Amino acid sequence: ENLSYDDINIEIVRLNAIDFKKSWAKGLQDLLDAFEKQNVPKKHSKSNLLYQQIFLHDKQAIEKEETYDSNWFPIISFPNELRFHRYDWRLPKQFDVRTLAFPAIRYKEYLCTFAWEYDFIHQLPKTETYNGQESIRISTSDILSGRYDTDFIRNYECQRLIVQLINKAFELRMKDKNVREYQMSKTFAYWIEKGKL
């Protein structure tokens, strides 16, 4: 590769040269192509496999466009506001927030029952609360950075709470459908039966 094209000796610079400078394999493949073109004579699978190996020494990828599916199913909309209700003395201390119709958490110092909606009746029918003390936060600032963080709840916790609500809501929803349950190590699996479909 240190021999300039302006320095090649006469009677060679006008011929058709094969480039072994970059890689010897490409040069050898070009040599074999030239030999096979101009009917060069040649004579137990040690050479057929060898020839295939030389040919496939570089099966480079092509500039072809492809489209790939994923398993990340997106969420197109959220409820407008995330609510925080008092329900003090109307919710027993020895009563878990699970086994309840709607996804609710009892997180933070007070203002428990983190659910998106009201109507936990027939399960704790105190039905006597003052809605003025309830705290309401916009889900837009919770998910999308913003100034949703305060001394009440910082932004990081405010999102790990929403992920918990979604993971619970999926579990409660996937029970009015027509599937049964399987218990894995750390999660639940949903499968369809034989009679259905």
Partner 1 sequence: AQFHDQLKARLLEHTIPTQILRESTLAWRDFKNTFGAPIRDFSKIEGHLAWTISTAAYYKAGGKPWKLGDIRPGVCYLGLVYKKIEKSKNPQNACCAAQMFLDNGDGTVFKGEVGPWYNPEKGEYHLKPKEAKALLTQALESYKEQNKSYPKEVFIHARTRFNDEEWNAFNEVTPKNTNLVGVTITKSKPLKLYKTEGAFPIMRGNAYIVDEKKAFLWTLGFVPKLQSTLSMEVPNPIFIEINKGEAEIQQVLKDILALTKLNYNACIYADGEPVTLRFANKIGEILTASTEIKTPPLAFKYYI
Partner 2 sequence: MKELIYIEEPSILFAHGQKCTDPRDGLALFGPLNQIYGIKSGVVGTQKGLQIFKSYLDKIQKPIYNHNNITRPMFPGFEAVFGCKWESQNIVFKEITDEEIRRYLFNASTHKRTYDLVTLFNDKIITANKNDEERVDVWFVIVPEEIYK
Partner 3 sequence: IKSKSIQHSSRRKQGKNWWNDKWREKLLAFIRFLSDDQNAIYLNVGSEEKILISNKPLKFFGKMSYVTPS
Partner DNA sequence: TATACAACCTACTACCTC
Binding site for partner 1 (CB under 8 A): 56-61, 66-72
Binding segment (CB under 7 A) for DNA, from list 48-56, 115-123, 137-145, 164-172: 164-172
Contact region with partner 3 (CB under 8 A), list: 29-37, 41-49, 74-82, 87-95: 74-82
DSSP 120-144: -TTTSTT----GGG-EEEEHHHHHS
> Toward RNA, which CB reaches closer, 76 or 184?
184
With CB under 7 A as the contact rule, the residue among 14, 93, 122, 147 that binds RNA is: 93
CA distances for 178 relative to 76, 99, 133, 173, angstroms:
24, 20, 41, 11
Q: Does 167 bind DNA (CB under 7 A)?
A: yes
Interacting residues toward partner 2 by CB under 8 A:
23-25, 45-46, 49, 52-53, 56-58, 61, 67-68
Q: Nearest Cα to 50, choosing from 32, 37, 62?
A: 32
**Nearer of residues 68 and 130 to partner 3, judged by Cβ:** 68
Report in angstroms the alpha-carbon separations of 102 from 15, 63, 114, 163, 172: 84, 51, 10, 15, 8
Residues that bind DNA (CB under 7 A): 96, 98, 159-160, 163-164, 167-168
